[PDB]
Paper text:
Here cryo-electron microscopy analyses of human CE pre-B complex and B-like complexes reveal extensive structural similarities with their CI counterparts. The results indicate that the CE and CI spliceosome assembly pathways converge already at the pre-B stage. Add-back experiments using purified CE pre-B complexes, coupled with cryo-electron microscopy, elucidate the order of the extensive remodelling events that accompany the formation of B complexes and B-like complexes. The molecular triggers and roles of B-specific proteins in these rearrangements are also identified.
To that end, we determined cryo-EM structures of complexes formed after the addition of an excess of 5′ss oligo to affinity-purified CE pre-B dimers in the absence or presence of ATP or ATPγS. ATPγS was previously shown to support the formation of human B complexes but prevents their subsequent transformation into activated B (Bact) complexes and/or their dissociation. The cryo-EM structures of the protomers of affinity-purified CE pre-B dimers incubated with 5′ss oligo (designated pre-B5′ss) or with 5′ss oligo plus ATPγS (designated pre-B5′ss+ATPγS) were determined at 4.2 Å and 3.1 Å, resolution, respectively, at their tri-snRNP cores. Owing to the absence of the B-specific protein SNU23, which stabilizes the binding of a second 5′ss oligo in B-like complexes, only one 5′ss oligo is bound in pre-B5′ss in a manner similar to the 5′ss oligo 1 in B-like complexes. As a consequence, U4/U6 stem III, the formation of which is mutually exclusive of that of an extended U6/5′ss helix, is still present, as well as the U4 quasi-pseudo knot and its associated proteins RBM42 and SNRNP27K. In pre-B5′ss complexes, 5′ss oligo binding triggers the movement of the PRP8 RT/En domain (PRP8RT/En) towards the PRP8 N-terminal domain (PRP8NTD). This action generates a half-closed PRP8 conformation that is also found in B-like and B complexes. The movement of PRP8RT/En that is triggered by the formation of the short U6/5′ss helix also destabilizes interactions between SAD1 and the BRR2 PWI domain (BBR2PWI) and between the U4 Sm core and the PRP8 RNase H-like (RH) domain (PRP8RH). These contacts help to tether BRR2 and PRP8RH to their docking sites in the pre-B complex.
Residue numbers in the entry:
A (entry chain A): 224 to 501
B (entry chain A): 613 to 660
C (entry chain U): 114 to 555
D (entry chain C): 116 to 951
E (entry chain G): 241 to 255, 270 to 356
F (entry chain A): 1113 to 1335
RNA sequence: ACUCUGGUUUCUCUUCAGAUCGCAUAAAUCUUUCGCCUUUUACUAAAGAUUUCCGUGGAGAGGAACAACUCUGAGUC
């Protein structure tokens, strides 16, 4: 059946090592600040499109919100604009910076900053104070404002009481690999799961979902924006009513007496199909 | 191609990542094939 | 200078209904107090040293110190506080006296030409016609009786009903000053209570609005109390002993009809329908005009309404596959008869109204005796006169309504329209398609 | 489950506690862990946390908690029985912390949370300072302990040093805020609980000692916790806590015996399935099933930590040790919250927390029903027992004994005191327990006290609720069409009750202005208004900042206004307030109710003011907190001293009115030392018209402000923008564009991140966080809270060039165009008249 | 130009024929705001490695701020270990380049 | 007016009538005071005229206000929407570049005191487009010369009526070019079922004296 | 330490879809608007509602294959 796979941590470590080339180094969802599907949803639900986001055809004419007449408070003579109200402001807070927001989506506000250090040299121990980590004040603090216990007068502990986990290496060779896998992208975060088909594994998917391939010609931008538009339109309409009866028509055709089964090379099948099409 | 030729790789035609368009063509063919099957059945029948 | 008490009582600066004192001179109601609050600011700005209280309506005797009203200008206090007891209601029931208002207009108890909303004016007309009954004004003025029924906290229907009744009593009270009364508070209460149905935003059907208002009034007085029969409901309840028969479908042949009869399919079954308001449908419209090609008006005799004794009992028609035999038979006729013409009806494409004349004389009737001969002893006062008739006018899309009501006892029979306050003669009243009629058994 | 109601009767088994968090995710994770421990039916999904404290759908979708959730249950203890914990989880946002201010009066104990990796934050420091000023117990919780263990992968000794540094910083902040001797906080003292809130890993020193005792031996857990908590070192040869540190290569007791086992377990679990072998599990005394082993790394670690570390007994023990019962803790709360004094007989009875005494319940929280039509007033019952159907008089926040009309009588329906299951089965609730009174929502807006109708005739409501943050962002509200204007207004009222921080004001220009603290705050306000409180679509305006009017120079000439009655004229001169006095007065340091001698001594010592000036009648703005102070410097030689005493109330009312509505933009005015020069008035009471003084007083105030040099003032918001080191300089660039000034910048101790404290003007603060996050490509994060008023450049009334309708004005021209736009928008005359 | 760009931006805010491939007229990334136009690349403090970007080029294209800070903060032993690691990496790179174009 | 018809909810401007053709900054300043005055004047006019003899419906009327709030006036004229703006109120970089405005002066001041910017009315443009649709409709068997002469008459009439408004109104130019191409394509499909790749313009512009359609056009096609 | 505990691979068959059926994504028809427009094949581009289509899960059933090796909890153990 080859449907579910149960594997081990080192295999994920080595596969992630090999696939680092095709996988971005982003680990925190805050990088997809205004490029997550909800931001594009609320951009499409409005006329305004973010500079990194594709344009869209408005759902309705929306002539009511197109050019409203000047009102007593809507007059620009009273509104003060210190900074332009860019599309970022509208997408971030659709319910505040947008008159008549109507049917919109809600975007995630924030995720705690992933404070992770990627392993640089395997030989060096994992539980090591990396130089990038800021130093802390190792103050002597001869003062004793904190409470202090008795001096060699109490706390008689039995010798059979060990500090629990003992005779076990605190740092092992596999600690770095596992702790790196713990912050892997979606495919490698799972220790073991179910298979997916070959054709529905989009490798380039994580690429355009990034903010931008910085340092690119205009045509690259246009291609990225258009393909993001296609992806977001695919994401919008996604509901299966298909409560099928699991009638495997292909299996029934296989069971039909008019056809038989055999084994052959793929190239032979290809030439057979070419002859059949001719 | 942009990524394949990102650095030391030449700016020539040497790019080999067909899967990205292969999946799109597979999906479009999957969408199309109902029409071709229906028309081929219409021809194969007598009420063409 | 301005009497804005018709609008909802709310703060002009705090947007709060608690402790909302009104400016006696400026005319603005704010929730602040006389010292160090919104009302203090208003008094120190508008210079109005007097401001009526939120509940006691006590004008500020001092600019900020004390709030004690003066009985000299108690006209507004009496206008905002309907306190006509039953003994005073008898004086109110004596409408023959010239009850000139504070401004010198005509009080018109129950038939005051109060202002109506631009849209859904049919709802306002229906409310005025309901308020045109002196029993309705007497019930509204009985605040202690109204306050006797407990108001559940969950439902806001009781509060809206109480507000509407208070507004109606104020309109019918002689203490009122302006003939035109803003229905903005009443319209908002109706929209909120009726779940936006028959809202003032768009024109609403008179029959549907009247039915919704009657149901709301019944709910306000009815409920968990032992007095299940609501006073509003019991006033116009009625009872029809429709021996409904599930007659066989027309497609069923004679053999199938005989089989169904042997199976008691077409057996008459009593419906015991409430029939709060009678709904009499006009006959078919004239497709081709024969007498006068310009316009043919097939006036329906008033006996068509009285035909419900046997004509409705002979009805063998339904919109379903099976031709249901209604066999309607009104057993108990309520003292108040509310007849709905239901001229508007939806065709296969658009809803059209039959322009047939009402042709209903305003005199004694005998439909109750026709409906049940033995009930004549119970219904001694069968002579019911059409108290208030409301007729639609104009195209079905952009249309309006106009009503004429008669004071009970006095019999003024005047048009309730604000411009045409006094119109006693029918002036071809039955010629127009009367939307609804309301009569009292008397 | 009837024991939940049974324990409510015992007034000594209740632990009224409110939570705080750097971010709402951390606190709500802990609350969800507590709920899962108490309720076995609800289990958090592997994909996402349950987040039972996020009742609102807005918080669930946005990810940041919106409204405080007062939900908890009876929880057991290691050395004690189950106590009915009731915890009001608070949002973890700087602006939303204003809602947490309500919780300050809900309970008398704050179990503060601090992230291990993030460390101290601006929100955490502000909450700690506010709690210290609120006279409540503080028990710190090191949150996200797994971050140091897993995310940072720091060495165990380095992790212990970082935790000790965080604890020391918290202790220093507490000591700076409050001088009480109970400020000592440490695992030995029992004020620090290490609770990662992830994988259900929570403990204290006592919890670890109890685990050790359960595993083997019979060591006294209290002594072991007292010894192993600090850096006292352990000698194996002596086999005892040896403060002299005899062993050369030994690790501290906490590092050796507490942090090290957790690190070993985490390394075994995350490292490999063979690392967390069944042999290792047996050595740890746990036998997980094959199904639990087949799960992913995160669920396996969560299950292992939850099974190994008990059921959060250490947190319960720490709370019981320090957070007092309502009977013990009611007296300080009676002293602080109550404005009637604890010396009152009813106040004294409440201080004893007598269920059978008078009924005195203070409701400050407001919660909408599922249908949204009706509300429910949530509040603590200080004294008495509320019963369903029992009528009660709900005195509002503005209620006073002067007028009894400020309070109304209402009936209380079902109580629904229990909130963990959100059920309404509660019939009556004793004193000291939180009650969700139903049916009394209409008479009261927020922070109102209910009381028995006839039992007491002199009890008054508690002091009005106060907030640390100040609402400075104002936004206009209009309907799409006026046809259903009142409906929206209805929702507006539902907004005012629901959010205490939000302020709805009906401006004279016919505009409904909502005042809030932060941009996200007002966005949530509008979302709740449109989706729940008023389905009508609402049009808005561009956000505006409330402005202040200040003085820089003394008045050139005196300004006098004459009362109409026989020309009674008062003359005055306004001068700028002394530097540093504004924040001192605004911090409730000195109140007008203080004795004259005490105020004179304070002014002579601190600000060296003249004793005669101090002895003058002092106003100090509205509620004695307005920075604009008024001193009646009228010469005693004049015969108007008796008249001044007879007109002191009118003068004070005029001054407070002028403070509320100034001459420019009619906004609040601060740091104005209004000196009442003199007044000549006829002694006849008839000539002393009450309404002839306050308008004259405000006219004098306006003229004096015009006579003095006028300046505009904008609220500079403090922002603690945390960002990675590389972007730090780029972060300053953002402040360069938005007219921001960097106040300080320090690296995060023990974390690669870097905090920058900056002072961004409110005018450019709108969307500053969005600019910072987008420009840094989603790396930097910011959080802005209003810090202080700063004088805007330019002159409000100087004739300057009119700015373009859609172009930013030059810096010298900002004040005049701000003033003109504010005056026109408010509806008053735009042009400023010197004669007026 | 930037001031006029903001000016017309605020003004705009307030006041068959077969084709072979996409056209550049649909680009939306053109924003005059220099902060938005020039966004600081998220290098993750020396840990940002884009997928398609060449690893060696990315190391060269890296701002080296994190690398320089780590070198400054590295101790003498840490500096020695880093020097040994980079020497081994250079030897490996020489080994690979020997095979290429041999 | 408030005494006759109160406006407590400020719903007067809820259903106001304004010209959507003009840009946002100049069409109509729907200030509360201006709307109230417009409604009051309309009510006064409706009261001064009996509802029986005639009527003045608000749904099909137009009111313009000029004051310290609104600096413009709108006229519908004889099927031509023209807005007058005084020069003494706003400058807005005044210049003499386009011919779509009119310079109006005072007898004594002898200086340009106000400028009238005029455009074809929406009703007039719709009527012209309907006329073009009618001309293209009767093309089943009508002669090509008849169709092209009908177009010549229509375009000549519109231009002779409001050349200045045709030049000023961009929408008028767009619609006239669109319907001109419509008629050209009608002639082309009359010639042959397919569509010419080049469609040379010599046929459509050679005068009938020389043997051609001779279509007068307001467009700009480069031969 | 004692008794019962009892498979997983598979092949098909019949149902129900909750569950991002699927951490992927097409197409057809109809419907309203937008560019429309020169008739359908068609379009452009979005919304709305279906359908087919690639697939999948749950659940049940029937044979083959490891059915004898038990896994495992219960059985005071
Ligand atoms: O016709 P376009 O879509 O604009 O792109 C083509 C072409 O693409 P095709 O191969 O699809 O015809 C080349 O692309 P590759 O050969 O790289 O695939 C070529 O690119 P190179 O010069 O890199 O070979 C060049 O693009 P450019 O010259 O901009 O790099 C060129 O585009 P132009 O037609 O715009 O020159």
């Amino acid at each position: 059946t080859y449907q579910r796979w149960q594997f081990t941590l080192p295999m994920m470590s080595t596969l992630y090592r090999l696939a680092n080339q095709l996988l971005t180094d982003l680990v925190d969802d805050n990088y997809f600040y205004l490029f997550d599907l909800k931001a594009f949803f609320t951009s499409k639900a409005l006329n305004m499109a973010i500079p990194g986001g594709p344009k869209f055809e408005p759902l309705v004419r929306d002539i009511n919100l197109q050019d409203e007449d000047w009102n007593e408070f809507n007059d620009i003579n009273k509104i003060i604009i210190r900074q332009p109200i860019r599309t970022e402001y509208k997408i971030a807070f659709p319910y505040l910076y947008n008159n008549l927001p109507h049917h919109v989506h809600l975007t995630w506000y924030h995720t705690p900053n992933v404070v992770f250090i990627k392993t640089e040299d395997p030989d060096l121990p994992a539980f090591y104070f990396d130089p990038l980590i800021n130093p802390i004040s190792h103050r002597h603090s001869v003062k004793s404002q904190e409470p202090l216990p008795d001096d060699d007068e109490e706390f008689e502990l039995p010798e059979f009481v060990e500090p629990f986990l003992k005779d076990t290496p605190l740092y092992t060779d596999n600690t770095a690999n596992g702790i790196a896998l713990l912050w892997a992208p979606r495919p490698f975060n799972l220790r073991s799961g179910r298979t997916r088909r070959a054709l529905d594994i989009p490798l380039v998917k994580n690429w355009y979902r990034e903010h931008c391939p910085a340092g690119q010609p205009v045509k690259v931008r246009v291609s990225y924006q258009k393909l993001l538009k296609y992806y977001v339109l695919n994401a919008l309409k996604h509901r299966p009513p298909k409560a099928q009866k699991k009638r495997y028509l292909f299996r029934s055709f296989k069971a039909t007496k008019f056809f038989q089964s055999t084994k052959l090379d793929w190239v032979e099948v290809g030439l057979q199909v070419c002859r059949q099409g001719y | 191609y942009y990524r394949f030729n990102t650095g030391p790789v030449g700016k020539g035609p040497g790019c080999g990542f067909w899967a990205a368009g292969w999946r799109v063509w597979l999906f479009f063919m999957r969408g199309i094939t109902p029409l071709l099957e229906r028309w081929l059945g219409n021809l194969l029948a007598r009420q063409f | 200078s301005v009497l804005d008490f018709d609008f909802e009582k709310l703060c002009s600066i705090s947007l709060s209904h608690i402790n909302a004192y009104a400016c006696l001179v400026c005319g603005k109601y704010f929730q602040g107090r006389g010292l160090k609050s919104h009302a203090y600011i208003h008094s120190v700005q508008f210079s109005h040293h007097v401001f009526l209280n939120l509940h006691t309506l006590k004008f500020y005797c001092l600019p900020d110190n004390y709030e004690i009203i003066d009985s000299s200008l108690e006209d507004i206090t009496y206008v905002l506080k309907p306190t006509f007891t039953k003994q005073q209601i008898a004086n109110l029931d004596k409408q023959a006296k010239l009850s000139r208002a504070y401004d010198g207009t005509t009080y018109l108890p129950g038939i005051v030409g109060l202002n109506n909303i631009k849209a859904n004016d049919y709802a306002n007309a229906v409310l005025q016609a309901l308020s045109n009954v002196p029993p309705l004004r007497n019930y509204f003025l009985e605040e202690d009786n109204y306050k006797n029924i407990k108001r559940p906290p969950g439902d806001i229907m009781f509060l809206l009903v109480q507000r509407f009744g208070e507004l109606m009593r104020k309109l019918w009270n002689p203490r009122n000053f302006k003939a035109h009364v803003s229905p903005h508070e009443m319209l908002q209460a109706v929209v909120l209570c009726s779940k936006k149905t028959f809202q003032i935003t768009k024109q609403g059907d008179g029959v549907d609005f009247l039915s919704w208002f009657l149901n709301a009034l019944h709910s306000a007085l009815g409920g968990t109390k032992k007095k299940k029969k609501t006073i509003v409901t019991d006033v116009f309840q009625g009872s029809m002993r429709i021996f409904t028969k599930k007659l066989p479908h027309p497609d069923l042949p004679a053999e199938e009809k005989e089989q169904l009869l042997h199976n008691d399919e077409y057996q008459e079954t009593m419906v015991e329908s409430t029939f709060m308001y009678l709904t009499l449908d006009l006959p078919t419209a004239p497709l081709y005009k024969d007498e006068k090609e310009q316009l043919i008006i097939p006036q329906v005799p008033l006996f068509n309404i009285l035909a419900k004794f046997n004509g409705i009992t002979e009805k063998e028609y339904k919109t379903y596959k099976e031709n249901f035999l209604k066999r309607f038979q009104l057993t108990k006729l309520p003292p108040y008869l509310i007849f709905c013409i239901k001229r508007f009806t939806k065709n296969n494409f658009f809803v059209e109204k039959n322009p047939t004349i009402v042709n209903f004389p305003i005199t004694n009737v005998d439909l109750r005796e026709y409906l049940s001969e033995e009930v004549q002893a119970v219904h001694k006062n069968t002579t019911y006169d059409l108290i208030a008739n409301i007729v639609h006018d104009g195209k079905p899309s952009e249309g309006s309504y106009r009503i004429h009501v008669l004071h009970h006892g006095t019999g003024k029979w005047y048009e309730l329209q604000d411009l045409q306050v006094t119109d006693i003669l029918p002036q071809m009243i039955t010629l127009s398609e009367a939307y609804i009629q309301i009569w009292k058994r008397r | 489950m009837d024991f939940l109601a049974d324990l409510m009767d015992n007034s000594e088994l209740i632990r009224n506690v409110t939570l705080c968090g750097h971010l709402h995710h951390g606190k709500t994770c802990f609350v969800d862990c507590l709920i899962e421990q108490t309720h076995p039916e609800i289990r958090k999904r592997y994909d996402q946390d349950l987040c039972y404290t996020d009742i609102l759908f807005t918080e669930q979708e946005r990810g940041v908690g919106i409204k405080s959730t007062p939900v908890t249950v009876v929880l057991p203890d290691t050395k004690g029985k189950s106590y009915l914990f009731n915890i009001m989880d608070t949002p973890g946002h700087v602006n939303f912390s204003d809602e947490v201010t309500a919780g300050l009066r809900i309970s008398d104990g704050v179990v503060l949370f601090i992230d291990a990796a993030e460390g101290v934050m601006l929100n955490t420091e502000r909450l700690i300072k506010h709690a210290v000023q609120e006279r409540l117990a503080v028990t710190v919780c090191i949150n996200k302990i797994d971050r140091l263990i897993l995310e940072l992968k720091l060495p165990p000794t380095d992790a212990y040093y970082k935790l000790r540094h965080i604890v020391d910083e918290v202790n220093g902040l507490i000591s700076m805020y409050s001088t009480d001797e109970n400020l000592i906080l440490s695992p030995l003292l029992g004020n620090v609980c290490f609770s990662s809130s992830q994988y259900s890993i929570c403990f204290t020193l006592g919890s670890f000692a109890k685990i050790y005792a359960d595993t083997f031996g019979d060591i006294n857990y209290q002594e072991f916790a007292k010894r192993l908590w600090g850096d006292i070192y352990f000698n194996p040869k002596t086999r005892k806590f040896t403060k002299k540190a005899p062993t050369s290569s030994s690790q501290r007791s906490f590092v050796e015996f507490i942090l090290e086992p957790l690190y070993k377990i985490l390394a075994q679990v995350v490292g490999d399935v063979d690392t967390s072998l069944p042999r290792t599990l047996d050595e740890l005394g746990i036998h997980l099933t094959k199904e639990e082993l087949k799960l992913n790394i995160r669920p396996l670690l969560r299950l292992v930590c939850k099974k190994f570390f008990g059921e959060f007994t250490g947190f319960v023990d720490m709370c019981v040790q320090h957070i007092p019962s309502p009977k013990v803790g009611a007296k300080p709360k009676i002293e602080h919250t109550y404005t009637g004094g604890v010396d009152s007989d009813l106040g004294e009875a409440m201080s004893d927390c007598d269920p059978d005494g008078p009924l005195m319940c203070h409701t400050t929280k407001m919660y909408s029903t599922d249908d949204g039509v009706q509300f429910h007033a949530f509040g603590r019952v200080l004294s008495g027992t509320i019963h369903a159907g029992q009528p009660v008089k709900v005195l509002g926040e503005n209620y006073t004994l002067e007028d009894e009309e400020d309070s109304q009588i209402c009936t209380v329906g079902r109580l629904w005191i229990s909130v963990a299951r959100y059920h309404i089965e509660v019939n009556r609730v004793p004193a000291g327990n939180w009650v969700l009174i139903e049916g009394v929502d209409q008479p009261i807006v927020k922070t109102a006290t209910i009381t028995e109708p006839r039992g007491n005739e002199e009890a008054q409501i508690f002091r009005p609720l106060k907030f640390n943050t100040t609402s400075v962002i104002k936004i206009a509200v209009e309907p799409v069409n006026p046809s259903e204007l009142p409906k929206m207004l209805d929702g507006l009222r539902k907004v005012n009750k629901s959010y205490p921080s939000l302020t709805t004001k009906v401006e004279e220009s016919g505009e409904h202005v909502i005042l809030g603290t932060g941009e996200l705050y007002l966005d949530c306000v509008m979302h709740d208004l449109r989706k729940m409180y008023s389905e009508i679509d609402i049009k808005v305006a561009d956000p505006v900042v409330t402005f202040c009017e200040t003085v820089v120079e003394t008045s050139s000439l005196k300004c006098f206004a004459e009362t109409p009655n026989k020309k009674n004229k008062i003359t005055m001169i306004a001068e700028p307030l002394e530097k540093g006095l504004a924040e001192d007065i605004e911090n409730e340091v000195v109140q007008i109710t203080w004795n004259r001698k005490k105020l004179g001594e304070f002014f002579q010592t601190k600000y060296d003011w003249d004793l005669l000036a101090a002895r003058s009648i002092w106003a100090f703005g509205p509620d004695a907190t307005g920075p604009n102070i008024l001193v009646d410097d009228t010469l005693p030689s004049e015969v108007d001293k008796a008249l001044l005493g007879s007109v002191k109330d009118s003068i004070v009312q005029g001054f407070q009115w002028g403070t509320r509505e100034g001459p420019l933009c009619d906004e609040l005015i601060r740091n104005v030392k209004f000196k009442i020069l003199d007044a000549v008035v006829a002694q006849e009471p008839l000539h002393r018209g009450g309404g002839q003084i306050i308008p004259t007083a405000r006219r004098v105030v306006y003229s004096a402000f015009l006579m003095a040099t006028p300046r505009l003032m904008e609220p500079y918001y403090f922002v603690e923008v945390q960002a990675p080191a590389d972007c730090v300089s780029a972060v300053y660039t953002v402040l360069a564009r938005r007219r921001g000034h960097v106040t300080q910048d320090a690296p995060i101790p023990g974390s690669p991140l870097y905090t920058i404290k900056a002072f961004i003007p409110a005018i450019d603060s709108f969307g500053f966080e969005t600019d910072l996050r987008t420009h840094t490509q989603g790396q930097a994060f910011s959080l802005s809270v209003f810090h202080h008023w700063q004088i805007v450049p330019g002159d409000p009334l100087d004739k300057s060039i009119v700015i373009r309708p859609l172009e930013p004005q030059p810096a010298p021209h900002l004040a005049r165009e701000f003033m003109i736009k504010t005056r026109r928008r408010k509806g008053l005359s735009e042009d400023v008249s010197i004669s007026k | 130009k930037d001031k006029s760009k903001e000016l017309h931006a605020i003004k705009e805010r307030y006041l068959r024929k077969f084709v072979f491939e996409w056209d550049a007229s649909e680009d939306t990334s053109i924003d005059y705001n220099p902060l938005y136009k020039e966004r600081h690349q998220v290098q993750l403090l020396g840990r940002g490695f884009i997928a398609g970007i060449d690893l060696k080029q990315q190391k060269r294209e890296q701002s080296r701020f994190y690398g320089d800070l780590m070198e400054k903060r590295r101790t003498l032993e840490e500096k020695e270990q880093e020097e040994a690691r980079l020497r081994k990496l250079r030897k490996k790179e020489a080994k690979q380049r020997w095979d290429d174009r041999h | 007016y408030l005494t006759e018809h109160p406006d407590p909810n400020n719903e007067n401007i809820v259903g106001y009538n304004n010209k959507k053709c003009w840009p946002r900054d100049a069409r109509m300043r729907l200030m509360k005071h201006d709307v109230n005055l417009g409604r009051a004047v309309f009510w006064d006019i409706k009261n001064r005229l009996p509802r029986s003899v005639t009527t003045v419906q608000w749904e099909n009327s137009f009111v313009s206000v000029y004051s310290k709030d609104n600096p413009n006036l709108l006229f519908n004229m004889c099927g031509f929407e023209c807005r007058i703006l005084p020069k003494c109120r706003t400058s807005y970089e005044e210049f003499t570049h386009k011919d779509g405005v009119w310079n109006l002066q005072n007898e004594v001041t002898k200086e340009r005191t106000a400028q009238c910017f005029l455009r074809v009315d929406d009703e007039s443009m719709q009527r012209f487009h309907n006329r073009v649709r009618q001309i293209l409709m009767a093309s089943g068997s009508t002669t090509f010369t008849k169709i092209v002469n009908k177009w010549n008459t229509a375009l000549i009439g519109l231009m002779t009526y409001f050349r200045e408004a045709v030049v000023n109104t961009q929408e008028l130019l767009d619609l006239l070019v669109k319907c001109e191409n419509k008629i050209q394509t009608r002639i082309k499909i009359g010639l042959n079922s397919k569509m010419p790749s080049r469609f040379p313009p010599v046929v459509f512009y050679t005068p009938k004296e020389l043997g051609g359609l001779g279509m007068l056009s307001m467009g700009h096609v480069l031969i």
